[PDB]
Design an enzyme around this catalytic site. Structure first.
Site, PDB file in Angstrom:
ATOM      1  N   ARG A   1       5.394  27.470 -48.482  1.00 32.95           N
ATOM      2  CA  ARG A   1       6.363  28.385 -48.407  1.00 32.95           C
ATOM      3  C   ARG A   1       6.649  29.019 -49.843  1.00 32.95           C
ATOM      4  O   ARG A   1       6.931  30.292 -50.239  1.00 32.95           O
ATOM      5  CB  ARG A   1       7.825  27.671 -48.274  1.00 32.95           C
ATOM      6  CG  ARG A   1       8.931  28.962 -47.906  1.00 32.95           C
ATOM      7  CD  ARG A   1      10.213  28.334 -47.588  1.00 32.95           C
ATOM      8  NE  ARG A   1      11.437  29.216 -47.312  1.00 32.95           N
ATOM      9  CZ  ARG A   1      12.361  29.100 -47.665  1.00 32.95           C
ATOM     10  NH1 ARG A   1      12.756  27.942 -48.335  1.00 32.95           N
ATOM     11  NH2 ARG A   1      13.542  29.972 -47.519  1.00 32.95           N
TER      12      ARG A   1
ATOM     13  N   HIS B   1       6.603  32.931 -50.852  1.00 28.66           N
ATOM     14  CA  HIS B   1       7.723  33.761 -51.394  1.00 28.66           C
ATOM     15  C   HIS B   1       7.150  34.114 -53.070  1.00 28.66           C
ATOM     16  O   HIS B   1       7.687  34.767 -53.836  1.00 28.66           O
ATOM     17  CB  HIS B   1       9.063  32.742 -51.877  1.00 28.66           C
ATOM     18  CG  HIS B   1       9.605  32.762 -50.702  1.00 28.66           C
ATOM     19  ND1 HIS B   1      11.132  32.252 -50.838  1.00 28.66           N
ATOM     20  CD2 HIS B   1       9.650  33.393 -49.338  1.00 28.66           C
ATOM     21  CE1 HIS B   1      11.648  32.428 -49.545  1.00 28.66           C
ATOM     22  NE2 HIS B   1      10.744  32.971 -48.803  1.00 28.66           N
TER      23      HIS B   1
ATOM     24  N   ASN C   1      16.040  32.065 -52.057  1.00 27.41           N
ATOM     25  CA  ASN C   1      15.459  30.964 -52.858  1.00 27.41           C
ATOM     26  C   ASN C   1      16.389  29.861 -53.338  1.00 27.41           C
ATOM     27  O   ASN C   1      16.288  28.503 -53.210  1.00 27.41           O
ATOM     28  CB  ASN C   1      14.556  31.418 -53.963  1.00 27.41           C
ATOM     29  CG  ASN C   1      13.370  32.092 -53.701  1.00 27.41           C
ATOM     30  OD1 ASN C   1      12.717  31.595 -52.761  1.00 27.41           O
ATOM     31  ND2 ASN C   1      12.972  33.422 -54.400  1.00 27.41           N
TER      32      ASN C   1
HETATM   33  C1  HEM Z   1       8.371  36.246 -40.742  1.00 27.97           C
HETATM   34  C2  HEM Z   1       9.596  36.203 -41.714  1.00 27.97           C
HETATM   35  C3  HEM Z   1       9.949  34.860 -42.269  1.00 27.97           C
HETATM   36  C4  HEM Z   1      11.220  34.481 -42.494  1.00 27.97           C
HETATM   37  C5  HEM Z   1      12.586  35.396 -41.747  1.00 27.97           C
HETATM   38  C6  HEM Z   1      11.350  33.127 -42.655  1.00 27.97           C
HETATM   39  C7  HEM Z   1      12.727  32.309 -42.988  1.00 27.97           C
HETATM   40  C8  HEM Z   1      12.551  31.062 -43.267  1.00 27.97           C
HETATM   41  C9  HEM Z   1      13.855  30.354 -43.318  1.00 27.97           C
HETATM   42  C10 HEM Z   1      15.333  31.048 -43.256  1.00 27.97           C
HETATM   43  C11 HEM Z   1      13.422  29.050 -43.609  1.00 27.97           C
HETATM   44  C12 HEM Z   1      14.536  28.002 -43.829  1.00 27.97           C
HETATM   45  C13 HEM Z   1      14.889  27.693 -45.267  1.00 27.97           C
HETATM   46  C14 HEM Z   1      15.872  26.831 -45.857  1.00 27.97           C
HETATM   47  O1  HEM Z   1      15.949  25.608 -44.801  1.00 27.97           O
HETATM   48  O2  HEM Z   1      16.630  26.736 -46.828  1.00 27.97           O
HETATM   49  C15 HEM Z   1      12.106  28.726 -43.802  1.00 27.97           C
HETATM   50  C16 HEM Z   1      11.271  27.953 -43.960  1.00 27.97           C
HETATM   51  C17 HEM Z   1       9.999  28.005 -43.933  1.00 27.97           C
HETATM   52  N1  HEM Z   1       9.070  28.981 -43.947  1.00 27.97           N
HETATM   53 FE1  HEM Z   1       9.571  30.909 -43.549  1.00 27.97          FE
HETATM   54  N2  HEM Z   1      10.121  32.604 -43.074  1.00 27.97           N
HETATM   55  C18 HEM Z   1       9.188  33.917 -42.693  1.00 27.97           C
HETATM   56  C19 HEM Z   1       7.875  33.827 -43.110  1.00 27.97           C
HETATM   57  C20 HEM Z   1       7.192  32.494 -43.437  1.00 27.97           C
HETATM   58  C21 HEM Z   1       5.765  32.562 -43.935  1.00 27.97           C
HETATM   59  C22 HEM Z   1       4.983  34.053 -43.978  1.00 27.97           C
HETATM   60  C23 HEM Z   1       5.197  31.531 -44.185  1.00 27.97           C
HETATM   61  C24 HEM Z   1       4.213  31.126 -45.068  1.00 27.97           C
HETATM   62  C25 HEM Z   1       2.771  31.544 -44.885  1.00 27.97           C
HETATM   63  C26 HEM Z   1       6.443  30.504 -44.112  1.00 27.97           C
HETATM   64  C27 HEM Z   1       6.845  29.077 -44.324  1.00 27.97           C
HETATM   65  C28 HEM Z   1       7.917  28.413 -44.285  1.00 27.97           C
HETATM   66  C29 HEM Z   1       7.810  26.983 -44.274  1.00 27.97           C
HETATM   67  C30 HEM Z   1       6.537  26.023 -44.046  1.00 27.97           C
HETATM   68  C31 HEM Z   1       9.091  26.628 -44.084  1.00 27.97           C
HETATM   69  C32 HEM Z   1       9.516  25.240 -44.428  1.00 27.97           C
HETATM   70  C33 HEM Z   1      10.160  24.967 -45.587  1.00 27.97           C
HETATM   71  C34 HEM Z   1      10.383  23.418 -46.087  1.00 27.97           C
HETATM   72  O3  HEM Z   1      10.524  22.690 -45.087  1.00 27.97           O
HETATM   73  O4  HEM Z   1      10.539  23.206 -47.445  1.00 27.97           O
HETATM   74  N3  HEM Z   1       7.617  31.328 -43.734  1.00 27.97           N
HETATM   75  N4  HEM Z   1      11.509  30.095 -43.589  1.00 27.97           N
HETATM   76 CA   LIG Z   2       5.246  36.520 -57.345  1.00 28.10          CA
END
Ligand code: HEM
Ligand SMILES: [Ca+2]
Ligand SMILES: N[C@@H](CCC(=O)N[C@@H](CS)C(=O)NCC(=O)O)C(=O)O
Ligand SMILES: [Ca+2]
Length: 300
Positions: free
Chosen positions: A38, A42, A67
Site C-alpha cells: 500500500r 500511495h 494517510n
Molecule cells: C482503487 C482505489 C483504491 C481505494 C479507494 C483504496 C482504499 C483503501 C482503504 C480506505 C483502505 C483501508 C485504510 C485504513 O484502514 O486505514 C485500504 C487498504 C489497503 N489497500 Fe487500498 N485502495 C485502492 C487501491 C489500492 C491499490 C492500487 C493497492 C495496491 C496495489 C492497494 C492496497 C491496499 C492494501 C494491501 C491495503 C491493506 C493495508 C494494511 O492492512 O495495512 N489499494 N485501501
Molecule cells: Ca511519491
C-alpha cells in the site's frame, strides 16, 4: 531508463538483502505484507514513485487525509534501508527499496512474482495536497477511474490493482457508513450480503472504536489470491469502492466482466496484476532527485 541490473556493480546483493528483511518483517507481523505494497501505491500516485511519502515534516504526505492514522510500515522500511546502506553506502534509492519490498510482499504471500526494474530517484519534496487527492473508498467508480487515468493508468489497472485487497485490513471508519443508515433511508447498503453485514455490525457498533479493523478479504485474509473477486460476485466486498466494481450501474459494461473473468482464472488475475504493478512502478513526475540516505529526510 530503469533496469534490473542498474546496481549490478554498485550493490550486487540488493535483491537478496531486501527479500530477507521483508521475510523477517512478515514473520513478526503478517499484515505488514499488505501495508508495504500500500505504501508503494500511495508513493507512486503522488509525484511519482519517488519515496516522497516517506518524508517527515509538518507538511508531510503522512498527514494527508488518506494517510493519517492509516498508512503504516515506515519503521520496517527504515530497517530494510539500514540493512541496504550497511552493505552498499549511498547507492540504492528509497524509491527502489519500496518497489522491491512491495513485490516481495506479494510473493511471500503466495502471489505472483516479477523481475523489478531499478533506477528510480528519490524526490526532494512532499506533496500533501496531491496526497489528499488519492482514491477514496467513498467516491463513485467514474471518479476512481479518472484518478487512474490522470497518472496514465486505465480501467484494467483499476480492477487488477484493486485485487491487492485480497489481503490486509480496513478500519471501521472507512466502511461503517454502509452498515446502518447508508443513504438516510435508515437502511444498510443494499449491495452488502446480509451475513457479512451482520458480522461487520458486530465489529463496528455505533459509537464504538472506529479504528478497529476487519479483513479486506473475508475468505483468505493473508493469502494473495483471486478470492477478492469471488467475494464481489456474492456482494461480500468490504469497501464500497470494492463492491461497486461489480454492483454499480457504471460497472455493468466496464469493470463487472473483468471481475467475473478474474474470478474464473487466477492465472489471468496474476498476469494482469503483474502488468499493472510494473506500469504503476513506472510513474514518474520527471523532477530532479537523488539517492536518499535516510528515507525520512532529504540529503542536503
Ligand atoms: C482503487 C482505489 C483504491 C481505494 C479507494 C483504496 C482504499 C483503501 C482503504 C480506505 C483502505 C483501508 C485504510 C485504513 O484502514 O486505514 C485500504 C487498504 C489497503 N489497500 Fe487500498 N485502495 C485502492 C487501491 C489500492 C491499490 C492500487 C493497492 C495496491 C496495489 C492497494 C492496497 C491496499 C492494501 C494491501 C491495503 C491493506 C493495508 C494494511 O492492512 O495495512 N489499494 N485501501
Ligand atoms: Ca511519491
Ligand atoms: N491500455 C492499453 C494497453 C495497456 C495494457 O497492455 N494493459 C494490460 C493490463 S496492465 C492489458 O492486458 N489490458 C489493458 C488494456 O487493454 O488497456 C490499450 O488500451 O491499448
Ligand atoms: Ca486473499
Amino acid at each position: 531508463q530503469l533496469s534490473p541490473d542498474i546496481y549490478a556493480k554498485s550493490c550486487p546483493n540488493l535483491v537478496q538483502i531486501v527479500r530477507k528483511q521483508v521475510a523477517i518483517a512478515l514473520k513478526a507481523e503478517i499484515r505488514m505484507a499488505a501495508s508495504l505494497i500500500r505504501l508503494h501505491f500511495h508513493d507512486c500516485f503522488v509525484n511519482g514513485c519517488d519515496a516522497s511519502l516517506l518524508l517527515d515534516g509538518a507538511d508531510s504526505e503522512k498527514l494527508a487525509i488518506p494517510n493519517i492514522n492509516s498508512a503504516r510500515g515506515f519503521e520496517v522500511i527504515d530497517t530494510i534501508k539500514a540493512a541496504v546502506e550497511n552493505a552498499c553506502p549511498g547507492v540504492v534509492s528509497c524509491a527502489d527499496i519500496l518497489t522491491l519490498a512491495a513485490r516481495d510482499s506479494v510473493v511471500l504471500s503466495g502471489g505472483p512474482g516479477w523481475r523489478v526494474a531499478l533506477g528510480r530517484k528519490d524526490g526532494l519534496v512532499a506533496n500533501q495536497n496531491s496526497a489528499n487527492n488519492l482514491p477514496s473508498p467513498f467516491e463513485p467508480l467514474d471518479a476512481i477511474i479518472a484518478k487512474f487515468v490522470a497518472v496514465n493508468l486505465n480501467i484494467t489497472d483499476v480492477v487488477a490493482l484493486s485485487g491487492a485487497h485480497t489481503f490486509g485490513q480496513a478500519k471501521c471508519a472507512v466502511f461503517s457508513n454502509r452498515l446502518f443508515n447508508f443513504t438516510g433511508a435508515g437502511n444498510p447498503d443494499a449491495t452488502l450480503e446480509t451475513s457479512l453485514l451482520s458480522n461487520l455490525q458486530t465489529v463496528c457498533p455505533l459509537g464504538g472504536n472506529s479504528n478497529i479493523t476487519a479483513p479486506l478479504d473475508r475468505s483468505t485474509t493473508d493469502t494473495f489470491d483471486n478470492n477478492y473477486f469471488k467475494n464481489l460476485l456474492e456482494g461480500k466486498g468490504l469497501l464500497s469502492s470494492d463492491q461497486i466494481l461489480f454492483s454499480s450501474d457504471l460497472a455493468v459494461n466496464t469493470t463487472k466482466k473483468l471481475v467475473e473473468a478474474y474470478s474464473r482464472s487466477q492465472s489471468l488475475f496474476f498476469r494482469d496484476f503483474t502488468c499493472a504493478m510494473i506500469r504503476m512502478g513506472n510513474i514518474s513526475n520527471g523532477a530532479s532527485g537523488e539517492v536518499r540516505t535516510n528515507c525520512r529526510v532529504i540529503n542536503n
